[PDB]
Each structure stands twice: as structure tokens, then as C-alpha cells.
Amino acid sequence: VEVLEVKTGVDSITEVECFLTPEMGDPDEHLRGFSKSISISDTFESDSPNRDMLPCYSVARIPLPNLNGNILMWEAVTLKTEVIGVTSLMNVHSNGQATHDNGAGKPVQGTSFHFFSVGGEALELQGVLFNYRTKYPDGTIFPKNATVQSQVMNTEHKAYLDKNKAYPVECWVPDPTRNENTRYFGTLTGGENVPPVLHITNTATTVLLDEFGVGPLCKGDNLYLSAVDVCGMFTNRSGSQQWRGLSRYFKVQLRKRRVKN
């Protein structure tokens, strides 16, 4: 795709605005946005997490208005995003773990992955494994033909974030060798006591244009929103811990870009 000039005029801009929900493992009918209380393998070799203990990448394909050699594509120009429902993390009274005698409950805290992408096609994933002998559970899409090299880098493990409740967070990352047509941003903070720090504002815009002033181009008139927001763990009264997730809002400005072939 040779990228030609920006079409301006009466209907040259458009907006997608949606929310993505978190797939944190969703144990039972009552715990949407949680994982199942985390268990630990009997041995390093026998690590095999159940599917309801594994947070997954969330993805959303949005169809854009139809337009179309010398054709038009939608260019994603700006993003606004924030986490929806940050205040819910102040609920320190719902069968939590008293930090001490007569203490309030221990609030949601600890290991966190906040990530979000805007793409003209699926987010492209590289597999990386903490432990290559980990057996990822029936019903998730995971790195196949794991070798010890999978633990550091193994280029066999490519994949498309093309399905929900599918790709576990802990064995997939954006593939930095690809994703020409996506803008991705994420942060891992690890540690059992890491405090959540979530900013919210409708005043913060993020630009999606590259070095050359071109944003993602929406192949097939489709925009791809991907996100993960593992906020920390909820500590139950027993001490048992469940990942807790939150929805992410997106609002993407798009414009029309002339393109050859």
C-alpha cells in the first residue's frame, strides 16, 4: 500500500466509541470480572492452570462505513481511553482480608497489566512462556511446540488476537517485529503489594500517527480495539486471591486516506 493524500470534505471524518469488557477467567455465574481463586502447581514441571484461572486479551472488530487500485481506507488518527469503574476498588468491606485486628479489608492490589491497542487489523502476538513445561488449558489458544527456547524467545509462536476468552495474557505479548498497522501501549507492574494507580479524564487525547503522519489503516473497513486491564488481585477472607479486571473505554477519531493497490 502506497499511502497518498488525506481526503477532506463534508464526510471525511468518523468516530468509533465503545467499551471492552475484561475476560479475567469468569469462574461461575456470579464472578464476571474475577478469576478463580489461584492455586499453585504441586511441582515446577506440572504447572497447568485451569482456564478460569487465566486472564485473556480482549479484542473488538468494529465495522466502519463502506468506501470502495486507487481506493480509500479509514485512517485512525486519535484515541481517548480510560479504565471504567476505578472507584469499585474502594469496596474494602465485601468478605475481604482484614489487614489487621478490626482492619478494613485488604483492597485490590498487586501484579497488574494495563494494555490497549488500535489497529487496522488484528493485534499480532509473539508467544513467550514463564515455564515452557506449563500446560495451557483446553479452550485457550496457546504457543504450540513449546521448547526451552520458548522461555526466552521462539519465533514459531506467532498468532493473531482474533478471538475473545481465547489468548491467555501470561503467554502472549504484542510482537514488536510486526504490528506495522497497529499502535499498542502497555505496562506490567509486578509485585504482591503494588498499589493500583488509575487516572481518569475526558481531557487526554493520544495521537495514532507514525513518524510519517500516517495512522493505522483499517483493512476490510474494520477497526481493531485490543485491551487488557488486570488491576491486581482481590484477597478473600481466607487469603485466597482472584485476579480482578475492569472494562476499558475507547473513542477513536478516523479520517479517509487515498491509497494505491
Partner 1 sequence: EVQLVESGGGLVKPGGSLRLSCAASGFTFSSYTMNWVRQAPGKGLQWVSSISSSSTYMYYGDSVKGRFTISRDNARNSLYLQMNSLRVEDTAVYYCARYAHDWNVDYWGQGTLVTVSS
Partner 2 sequence: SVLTQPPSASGTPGQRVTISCSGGSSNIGSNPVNWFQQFPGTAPKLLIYANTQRPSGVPDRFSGSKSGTSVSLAISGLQSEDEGDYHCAAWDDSLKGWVFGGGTKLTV
Q: What residue 36 binds from its own copies, partner 1, partner 2, none (CB within 5 to 8 A, per partner kind)?
A: partner 2
Largest Cα–Cα distance of the chain, in whole Å?
72
Torsions phi, psi for 53 (to 5 deg): -105, 0
Neighbours of 142 (CB within 10 A): 20
By CB under 8 A, tell whether 30 contacts partner 1: yes
Give the whole-angstrom CA distance, residue 243 versus residue 111: 9
Q: What residue 10 binds from partner 2, partner 1, its own copies, none (CB within 5 to 8 A, per partner kind)?
A: none
Residues 215-254, interacting with partner 2 (CB under 8 A): 236-240
Residues 92-121, interacting with partner 1 (CB under 8 A): 95
DSSP state of 195: P
Among 39, 88, 149, 155, binds partner 2 (CB under 8 A): 39
Neighbours of 165 (CB within 10 A): 14
Q: What residue 126 binds from its own copies, partner 2, partner 1, none (CB within 5 to 8 A, per partner kind)?
A: its own copies
Q: Which is nearer to partner 1, 2 or 29 (CB)?
A: 29
Q: Which is nearer to its own copies, 6 or 31 (CB)?
A: 31
Give long-range contacts, CB 8 A cutoff, 24+ apart: 232-235.
232/89, 232/108, 232/109, 232/110, 232/111, 232/112, 232/194, 232/196, 233/38, 233/108, 233/109, 233/110, 233/111, 233/192, 234/34, 234/96, 234/108, 235/96, 235/97, 235/105, 235/106
Closest-CA residue to 33 (of 244, 248, 249): 244
By CB under 8 A, tell whether 106 contacts partner 2: no
Least Cβ distance, residue 29 to partner 1 (angstroms):
6
Please, are residues 106 and 244 in contact by the beta-carbon 8 Å criterion? no
Q: Which is nearer to partner 1, 135 or 260 (CB)?
A: 135
Q: What residue 15 binds from partner 1, its own copies, partner 2, none (CB within 5 to 8 A, per partner kind)?
A: none
Count interface residues toward partner 2 (CB under 8 A): 15
By CB under 8 A, tell whether 42 contacts partner 2: yes
Give long-range contacts, CB 8 A cutoff, 24+ apart: 145-149.
none
By CB under 8 A, tell whether 138 contacts partner 2: no
By CB under 8 A, tell whether 29 contacts partner 1: yes
Beta-ladder partners of 217: 75
By CB under 8 A, tell whether 238 contacts partner 1: yes
DSSP state of 87: G
Interface ranges with partner 2 (CB under 8 A): 36-37, 39-43, 48, 50, 53, 236-240
Interface ranges with partner 1 (CB under 8 A): 29-31, 37, 43-46, 95, 133, 236-238, 240
